[PDB]
Amino acid sequence: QIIEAQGDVQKDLQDAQAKAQADLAKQNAAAQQRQAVAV
Amino acid sequence: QIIEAQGDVQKDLQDAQAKAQADLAKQNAAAQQRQAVAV
């Protein structure tokens, strides 16, 4: 039970981390295309 | 209960860290576009 609780809290922690990383990557790609399209 | 409290305090810690990282990335992108638009 203790290991399952720790695994669940971890799993949501890395799920939030992965979502944040994906959002950051999307924002970086948007910034890159915005700065590259200008000419 | 202890594991849930630790998970909650961690979760807010990495949420603040991700928000700070996103703000830093936005500031860096703004600085890059400002320094590149000058010609």
Tokens found for residue A34:
């915005």
Instruction: Report the distance separating Cα B29 and Cα A38, nearest Å.
Output: 14
* Secondary structure of residue A38 in the 3-state scheme: coil
Instruction: Report the distance separating Cα A1 and Cα B6, nearest Å.
Output: 16
Report the C-alpha dihedral over residues A29, A34, B29, A15, rounded to 10 degrees: -30
Nearest-CA neighbor of A21 among B28, B29, B15, B30? B15
Amino acid at the residue B8? D
Please name the method used to determine this structure: cryo-EM
Nearest to B22 among A6, A24, A34 (CB): A24
Q: Which residue of B has its CA nearest to A36?
A: B33
Q: Which of B8, B10, B23 to mutate to test the interface with A (most CBs of A within 10 A)?
A: B10
Determine contact, residues A9/B7, Cβ cutoff 8 Å.
Answer: yes
Nominal resolution in Å? Answer: 3.8
Instruction: Report the distance separating Cα A31 and Cα B10, nearest Å.
Output: 30
